[PDB]
């Protein structure tokens, strides 16, 4: 259904953004 | 009480004209739908014509259509049946019947063998 | 108040037992369709069937039908007709061939009109049985009796396009049948408004499909009511 | 016929004489005598109970003499005796004929009677010898539907029928002992006098007749209504009665003055009355209507006092308890409501 | 017909029987009704709503 | 995943610490002051020359790209070129370096679900308040209203939980705290409840359709018996595939608070029954429209089309047949703009479906308006 798929897509995007930001955190210290 | 007198019936030649009047008393005339019924000699009662409360909706039986006209005067509490072309088959006692209830479209028992709110009737004889 | 509590418990038990019986009574009542068989005694109504009221129970397609006809009652109907406001349908039986012998068909027409416009019957559908077609056929074919004598409209009337006459049926017979049907239909359509409906049927008193016609008309009535409740119709 | 014509002329003369006698006895009207009486004010009655359990519409109900138990008749072929105090069902009698139009509770409380389109008044004994309510007696003399029935006592009951007659029955022998004839229309209702020596009946000829129970003759005939009379009820005094008619009016008739006392009508009311009943004191006239409401009327004045506006369909019956505590209304929505 | 003449005779007989009765004045009957309503006002629960203490339905 | 990268980076840091303990230069006093940077581990290179170090493998993309190497230049004195006008080690990470639609969708269905929830609680109050409206049809409508309300509430709760799952404090604990809201069991039950509410709403739309299709063409039945069966179908049946889905998610693929459908086979445990309900309800819709058009034909032509359109439009929210348009467009195949249109139409129609159902079956209902008029009339008297 639509809700499931939308939540999965949003969670995947948020996971990728969090990974990128954590990598950015390592650069600063 | 609810009382109805018919007048004007009498002997008339075939093809002649006659007028029936119905004097009503004991009820509000304008709230009721009126009827005309006749009883042929030795045979049952048959509905002839009726007129609505305001005098707008008028219906006739097929046999008299185009010959009889029904009229009411609310001010004078009088019902009329003007006759134009009589036939020997029109010989019957003509009763002025009233619908049982006011402000009602339906009208059930005006042709019953024993029905109140119906006058004594006037005899119309057509012969030569 | 111990005796009061005991009698209250007994009363509550009796009420529970009565309601338990009333549940199954309700189940039986809702599964049954009630029909008022109304018509003149000379209209073939009695032959269709085979105290002030007679009851006959017949089951069609595992559906229970309860049809009541009028017994020892006076001809004044405006009071006891109100008892049948909640019936599934009123089966009206009319003698089609009796258009000359008293204007009997005109009296049936007036009775149908007063039924249609009664305030308490405004939600009740009418299954119309224009009975005695095998007599109307011979009446029209013989030509000794003219419908135009009692209904001047029959001169200018033309057979409707949607007519579906049976094979081997004379055009005059079909025109007479459809004129008689259209009189009742003209009464029906004046004040229908979708609250109740009429189901004309050309019928003979010996027809074996009459129960099937009643079943189909009742099923249509129930479906229309259910669709009205959902505001689909 | 000259004989018929002269008989009708003589009847007209007698009617005229009665009319002038009644006019001579009409020195003043009840409305202009009760001017100085203070109005009853606004009567605000509330629904105290709602009895549910009937599958179809209710035609009749009748209070018990104890003002607690009432019986109701429904077109689903059920007689239910209710305990109005606790709303519990005491009995649920299945009816042989589903088309019941009247029900009566015996003053002794040991019997109920019902009848309808089957033309039969069936007597059930509530004080069952074995435990189950059964048919005690079937009265099968009428040739028209029963519209009302009232016990005079055990072993005596008066019924009104659609064959334009009222009858008095002996329940033990199941035979009519007296037949009351004279009405030209269906007799729709009857009301017993408090002493049970007389009873009035309203018929579909727009007339009401006062009968002598001991002597089957008719004593007085009351006119003034314009359409069928659906309901009738004695004044608690016993010297007057009220009628409900399809002409959307209620009227009060005095026995000794032999004429109408006053009319209870409103311009906004255009529907007939199905049931009438007086309060314990007779100061209020309660009338059920086709427009789903009950109107409470000042009896001595013409003022409408209040309205009972709870029912969702036609109000078919109402009755007031013997002690005057509560009024119950049956309706075509299959509910009985108790009002205080 | 014999049926109609018989019912006409019955109607005439009934009207004769009802015509010869004694009728009191309408004012007197109204006064008696007013007196009964006044003398029983305090015994009518519907006229004067009794408090909930002695109502079996409140 | 953030978690796996966290342990990969910490094991890389442990390896760097071990290598610093076993430093290749035994403190020659000429080697560069090698330090363990937070991003990459660099040893002591030759003083006065640039040193190239491969980018660390814990990066999700640089693991498969060993070509990108971070080059740092060290002076003969052990120092590095100043960065940002400060004494900071030199670093060159350019060699291994590497939303609006979803926000709009979120706004749209949040607004729609809020309006639907408000209208549905008002409609439930109206239907329950009037005693004359109590019937099997209205009981099933009330159950459908409750299912829609529960779905909207679950959507609000899961959106809040998604916000909590990625709050700045929440990700803060991810690499150092090691315990956050994601590891909590309450986050799993939030999305399990969301799945159950969605399935229950779909099966209550199916129950609406089945009850209508039993009223039409299916004779008579024990009304009290079927109502219990209908309640069981509406509520209990979704438990028969949501709970096994939860068990499968717990045993296998237990990560991300059960929010991501990495394995579509496990995601088929919930989609297939919902698709079956949608298909059966679409067949019921077809049959009911056929019955309606036959009834209209039995009774002008241009008025028939308008009446048929009004009935079909009104029947769509009650049966939820708008899902049939994109129901068979599978997740695995929807990509690009097709996926966006599918998600947009589904979310926007479902969010406002509760509002439309409430309006159509409570507010414009003839019986409800009649009850309101009667109640107003009683107030005047």
mmCIF file of N, CA, C and O in Angstrom, chain D residues 62 102-107 111-115 120-124 137-140 142 146 148-160 166-172 174-180 190 192 199 213-214:
data_model
loop_
_atom_site.group_PDB
_atom_site.id
_atom_site.type_symbol
_atom_site.label_atom_id
_atom_site.label_comp_id
_atom_site.label_asym_id
_atom_site.label_seq_id
_atom_site.Cartn_x
_atom_site.Cartn_y
_atom_site.Cartn_z
ATOM 1 N N UNK D 62 -53.346 -0.580 26.820
ATOM 2 C CA UNK D 62 -54.336 -0.354 27.864
ATOM 3 C C UNK D 62 -53.659 -0.487 29.216
ATOM 4 O O UNK D 62 -53.053 -1.521 29.507
ATOM 5 N N UNK D 102 -56.853 -3.863 18.509
ATOM 6 C CA UNK D 102 -57.282 -3.425 19.825
ATOM 7 C C UNK D 102 -56.780 -4.405 20.870
ATOM 8 O O UNK D 102 -56.498 -5.568 20.577
ATOM 9 N N UNK D 103 -56.666 -3.913 22.098
ATOM 10 C CA UNK D 103 -56.312 -4.746 23.236
ATOM 11 C C UNK D 103 -56.930 -4.139 24.483
ATOM 12 O O UNK D 103 -56.983 -2.917 24.627
ATOM 13 N N UNK D 104 -57.413 -5.001 25.370
ATOM 14 C CA UNK D 104 -58.001 -4.573 26.626
ATOM 15 C C UNK D 104 -57.399 -5.383 27.759
ATOM 16 O O UNK D 104 -57.099 -6.569 27.604
ATOM 17 N N UNK D 105 -57.202 -4.733 28.901
ATOM 18 C CA UNK D 105 -56.678 -5.393 30.084
ATOM 19 C C UNK D 105 -57.890 -5.445 30.994
ATOM 20 O O UNK D 105 -58.627 -4.465 31.094
ATOM 21 N N UNK D 106 -58.109 -6.573 31.657
ATOM 22 C CA UNK D 106 -59.240 -6.697 32.564
ATOM 23 C C UNK D 106 -59.000 -5.880 33.832
ATOM 24 O O UNK D 106 -57.863 -5.780 34.300
ATOM 25 N N UNK D 107 -60.044 -5.268 34.396
ATOM 26 C CA UNK D 107 -59.862 -4.537 35.661
ATOM 27 C C UNK D 107 -59.347 -5.411 36.787
ATOM 28 O O UNK D 107 -58.573 -4.936 37.624
ATOM 29 N N UNK D 111 -57.026 -11.127 33.025
ATOM 30 C CA UNK D 111 -57.275 -11.408 31.621
ATOM 31 C C UNK D 111 -56.822 -10.243 30.757
ATOM 32 O O UNK D 111 -56.790 -9.093 31.200
ATOM 33 N N UNK D 112 -56.471 -10.562 29.515
ATOM 34 C CA UNK D 112 -56.323 -9.578 28.454
ATOM 35 C C UNK D 112 -57.154 -10.040 27.269
ATOM 36 O O UNK D 112 -57.359 -11.238 27.057
ATOM 37 N N UNK D 113 -57.636 -9.077 26.497
ATOM 38 C CA UNK D 113 -58.395 -9.351 25.291
ATOM 39 C C UNK D 113 -57.758 -8.613 24.129
ATOM 40 O O UNK D 113 -57.213 -7.522 24.294
ATOM 41 N N UNK D 114 -57.824 -9.222 22.951
ATOM 42 C CA UNK D 114 -57.316 -8.585 21.748
ATOM 43 C C UNK D 114 -58.158 -9.031 20.565
ATOM 44 O O UNK D 114 -58.801 -10.083 20.594
ATOM 45 N N UNK D 115 -58.150 -8.211 19.524
ATOM 46 C CA UNK D 115 -58.902 -8.516 18.324
ATOM 47 C C UNK D 115 -58.462 -7.612 17.200
ATOM 48 O O UNK D 115 -57.765 -6.617 17.407
ATOM 49 N N UNK D 120 -62.456 -11.572 15.633
ATOM 50 C CA UNK D 120 -62.557 -12.402 16.826
ATOM 51 C C UNK D 120 -61.930 -11.662 17.996
ATOM 52 O O UNK D 120 -60.831 -11.112 17.871
ATOM 53 N N UNK D 121 -62.631 -11.642 19.129
ATOM 54 C CA UNK D 121 -62.077 -11.172 20.393
ATOM 55 C C UNK D 121 -61.584 -12.388 21.166
ATOM 56 O O UNK D 121 -62.384 -13.214 21.613
ATOM 57 N N UNK D 122 -60.270 -12.500 21.317
ATOM 58 C CA UNK D 122 -59.655 -13.610 22.027
ATOM 59 C C UNK D 122 -59.361 -13.191 23.459
ATOM 60 O O UNK D 122 -58.810 -12.112 23.693
ATOM 61 N N UNK D 123 -59.732 -14.041 24.410
ATOM 62 C CA UNK D 123 -59.517 -13.785 25.828
ATOM 63 C C UNK D 123 -58.398 -14.698 26.301
ATOM 64 O O UNK D 123 -58.471 -15.921 26.131
ATOM 65 N N UNK D 124 -57.365 -14.107 26.890
ATOM 66 C CA UNK D 124 -56.254 -14.839 27.477
ATOM 67 C C UNK D 124 -56.286 -14.648 28.985
ATOM 68 O O UNK D 124 -56.480 -13.527 29.461
ATOM 69 N N UNK D 137 -60.841 -18.015 25.680
ATOM 70 C CA UNK D 137 -62.131 -17.938 25.012
ATOM 71 C C UNK D 137 -61.985 -17.112 23.744
ATOM 72 O O UNK D 137 -61.274 -16.105 23.733
ATOM 73 N N UNK D 138 -62.662 -17.544 22.684
ATOM 74 C CA UNK D 138 -62.704 -16.820 21.423
ATOM 75 C C UNK D 138 -64.146 -16.443 21.117
ATOM 76 O O UNK D 138 -65.019 -17.314 21.065
ATOM 77 N N UNK D 139 -64.389 -15.152 20.917
ATOM 78 C CA UNK D 139 -65.723 -14.621 20.664
ATOM 79 C C UNK D 139 -65.825 -14.296 19.180
ATOM 80 O O UNK D 139 -65.134 -13.399 18.688
ATOM 81 N N UNK D 140 -66.695 -15.014 18.475
ATOM 82 C CA UNK D 140 -66.683 -15.075 17.016
ATOM 83 C C UNK D 140 -68.052 -14.747 16.436
ATOM 84 O O UNK D 140 -68.609 -15.498 15.634
ATOM 85 N N UNK D 142 -68.872 -11.233 15.395
ATOM 86 C CA UNK D 142 -68.823 -10.038 14.567
ATOM 87 C C UNK D 142 -68.519 -10.386 13.113
ATOM 88 O O UNK D 142 -67.766 -11.315 12.817
ATOM 89 N N UNK D 146 -62.754 -6.011 14.641
ATOM 90 C CA UNK D 146 -62.875 -5.375 15.944
ATOM 91 C C UNK D 146 -61.949 -4.174 16.029
ATOM 92 O O UNK D 146 -60.749 -4.281 15.766
ATOM 93 N N UNK D 148 -62.313 -1.949 18.947
ATOM 94 C CA UNK D 148 -62.125 -1.673 20.363
ATOM 95 C C UNK D 148 -62.815 -2.753 21.179
ATOM 96 O O UNK D 148 -63.757 -3.395 20.713
ATOM 97 N N UNK D 149 -62.329 -2.943 22.401
ATOM 98 C CA UNK D 149 -62.934 -3.864 23.349
ATOM 99 C C UNK D 149 -62.612 -3.378 24.751
ATOM 100 O O UNK D 149 -61.525 -2.852 24.994
ATOM 101 N N UNK D 150 -63.565 -3.540 25.663
ATOM 102 C CA UNK D 150 -63.382 -3.119 27.046
ATOM 103 C C UNK D 150 -64.094 -4.102 27.957
ATOM 104 O O UNK D 150 -65.266 -4.412 27.739
ATOM 105 N N UNK D 151 -63.390 -4.584 28.975
ATOM 106 C CA UNK D 151 -64.019 -5.441 29.966
ATOM 107 C C UNK D 151 -64.939 -4.613 30.852
ATOM 108 O O UNK D 151 -64.535 -3.571 31.376
ATOM 109 N N UNK D 152 -66.180 -5.067 31.015
ATOM 110 C CA UNK D 152 -66.988 -4.564 32.118
ATOM 111 C C UNK D 152 -66.515 -5.164 33.432
ATOM 112 O O UNK D 152 -66.433 -4.472 34.452
ATOM 113 N N UNK D 153 -66.195 -6.445 33.409
ATOM 114 C CA UNK D 153 -65.609 -7.202 34.508
ATOM 115 C C UNK D 153 -65.113 -8.503 33.896
ATOM 116 O O UNK D 153 -65.075 -8.645 32.668
ATOM 117 N N UNK D 154 -64.720 -9.454 34.730
ATOM 118 C CA UNK D 154 -64.549 -10.805 34.227
ATOM 119 C C UNK D 154 -65.906 -11.340 33.790
ATOM 120 O O UNK D 154 -66.932 -11.038 34.406
ATOM 121 N N UNK D 155 -65.912 -12.106 32.701
ATOM 122 C CA UNK D 155 -67.095 -12.729 32.115
ATOM 123 C C UNK D 155 -68.012 -11.747 31.395
ATOM 124 O O UNK D 155 -69.116 -12.130 30.999
ATOM 125 N N UNK D 156 -67.595 -10.499 31.204
ATOM 126 C CA UNK D 156 -68.371 -9.559 30.409
ATOM 127 C C UNK D 156 -67.423 -8.605 29.702
ATOM 128 O O UNK D 156 -66.493 -8.080 30.316
ATOM 129 N N UNK D 157 -67.668 -8.379 28.415
ATOM 130 C CA UNK D 157 -66.820 -7.505 27.612
ATOM 131 C C UNK D 157 -67.663 -6.903 26.498
ATOM 132 O O UNK D 157 -68.528 -7.570 25.926
ATOM 133 N N UNK D 158 -67.417 -5.630 26.203
ATOM 134 C CA UNK D 158 -68.116 -4.899 25.154
ATOM 135 C C UNK D 158 -67.133 -4.630 24.024
ATOM 136 O O UNK D 158 -66.028 -4.131 24.262
ATOM 137 N N UNK D 159 -67.531 -4.965 22.800
ATOM 138 C CA UNK D 159 -66.683 -4.817 21.628
ATOM 139 C C UNK D 159 -67.365 -3.939 20.590
ATOM 140 O O UNK D 159 -68.585 -3.990 20.427
ATOM 141 N N UNK D 160 -66.570 -3.135 19.893
ATOM 142 C CA UNK D 160 -67.026 -2.366 18.745
ATOM 143 C C UNK D 160 -66.375 -2.927 17.491
ATOM 144 O O UNK D 160 -65.201 -3.310 17.511
ATOM 145 N N UNK D 166 -71.985 -2.565 17.962
ATOM 146 C CA UNK D 166 -71.313 -2.898 19.207
ATOM 147 C C UNK D 166 -72.059 -4.049 19.865
ATOM 148 O O UNK D 166 -73.280 -4.163 19.742
ATOM 149 N N UNK D 167 -71.320 -4.909 20.558
ATOM 150 C CA UNK D 167 -71.892 -6.110 21.145
ATOM 151 C C UNK D 167 -71.443 -6.263 22.589
ATOM 152 O O UNK D 167 -70.377 -5.786 22.981
ATOM 153 N N UNK D 168 -72.278 -6.934 23.377
ATOM 154 C CA UNK D 168 -71.970 -7.290 24.754
ATOM 155 C C UNK D 168 -71.902 -8.806 24.852
ATOM 156 O O UNK D 168 -72.806 -9.501 24.380
ATOM 157 N N UNK D 169 -70.838 -9.315 25.459
ATOM 158 C CA UNK D 169 -70.541 -10.737 25.430
ATOM 159 C C UNK D 169 -70.591 -11.337 26.826
ATOM 160 O O UNK D 169 -70.320 -10.666 27.822
ATOM 161 N N UNK D 170 -70.948 -12.616 26.876
ATOM 162 C CA UNK D 170 -70.787 -13.452 28.059
ATOM 163 C C UNK D 170 -69.609 -14.375 27.780
ATOM 164 O O UNK D 170 -69.704 -15.269 26.934
ATOM 165 N N UNK D 171 -68.502 -14.155 28.486
ATOM 166 C CA UNK D 171 -67.262 -14.853 28.162
ATOM 167 C C UNK D 171 -67.383 -16.345 28.450
ATOM 168 O O UNK D 171 -66.805 -17.173 27.737
ATOM 169 N N UNK D 172 -68.126 -16.718 29.495
ATOM 170 C CA UNK D 172 -68.280 -18.135 29.815
ATOM 171 C C UNK D 172 -68.949 -18.892 28.675
ATOM 172 O O UNK D 172 -68.433 -19.911 28.203
ATOM 173 N N UNK D 174 -69.506 -17.589 25.669
ATOM 174 C CA UNK D 174 -69.024 -17.120 24.385
ATOM 175 C C UNK D 174 -70.114 -16.660 23.448
ATOM 176 O O UNK D 174 -69.977 -16.806 22.231
ATOM 177 N N UNK D 175 -71.193 -16.100 23.982
ATOM 178 C CA UNK D 175 -72.339 -15.690 23.188
ATOM 179 C C UNK D 175 -72.621 -14.212 23.405
ATOM 180 O O UNK D 175 -72.409 -13.678 24.495
ATOM 181 N N UNK D 176 -73.103 -13.557 22.355
ATOM 182 C CA UNK D 176 -73.562 -12.183 22.487
ATOM 183 C C UNK D 176 -74.849 -12.147 23.295
ATOM 184 O O UNK D 176 -75.798 -12.878 23.001
ATOM 185 N N UNK D 177 -74.882 -11.296 24.314
ATOM 186 C CA UNK D 177 -76.097 -11.089 25.084
ATOM 187 C C UNK D 177 -76.862 -9.850 24.652
ATOM 188 O O UNK D 177 -78.074 -9.781 24.875
ATOM 189 N N UNK D 178 -76.187 -8.881 24.043
ATOM 190 C CA UNK D 178 -76.827 -7.664 23.571
ATOM 191 C C UNK D 178 -76.059 -7.147 22.367
ATOM 192 O O UNK D 178 -74.827 -7.182 22.350
ATOM 193 N N UNK D 179 -76.790 -6.675 21.364
ATOM 194 C CA UNK D 179 -76.205 -6.058 20.184
ATOM 195 C C UNK D 179 -76.691 -4.621 20.094
ATOM 196 O O UNK D 179 -77.896 -4.363 20.171
ATOM 197 N N UNK D 180 -75.757 -3.694 19.935
ATOM 198 C CA UNK D 180 -76.062 -2.272 19.872
ATOM 199 C C UNK D 180 -75.950 -1.824 18.421
ATOM 200 O O UNK D 180 -74.854 -1.789 17.859
ATOM 201 N N UNK D 190 -64.832 2.883 21.636
ATOM 202 C CA UNK D 190 -65.870 2.968 22.645
ATOM 203 C C UNK D 190 -65.224 3.299 23.980
ATOM 204 O O UNK D 190 -64.053 2.991 24.212
ATOM 205 N N UNK D 192 -66.188 3.210 28.212
ATOM 206 C CA UNK D 192 -67.111 2.841 29.273
ATOM 207 C C UNK D 192 -67.269 3.985 30.261
ATOM 208 O O UNK D 192 -66.302 4.674 30.595
ATOM 209 N N UNK D 199 -72.087 3.426 27.878
ATOM 210 C CA UNK D 199 -70.848 3.597 27.138
ATOM 211 C C UNK D 199 -71.144 4.362 25.862
ATOM 212 O O UNK D 199 -72.200 4.182 25.254
ATOM 213 N N UNK D 213 -76.166 -0.165 28.741
ATOM 214 C CA UNK D 213 -75.651 -1.530 28.714
ATOM 215 C C UNK D 213 -76.760 -2.526 29.032
ATOM 216 O O UNK D 213 -76.906 -3.552 28.359
ATOM 217 N N UNK D 214 -77.559 -2.235 30.061
ATOM 218 C CA UNK D 214 -78.635 -3.142 30.446
ATOM 219 C C UNK D 214 -79.702 -3.236 29.363
ATOM 220 O O UNK D 214 -80.192 -4.329 29.058
#
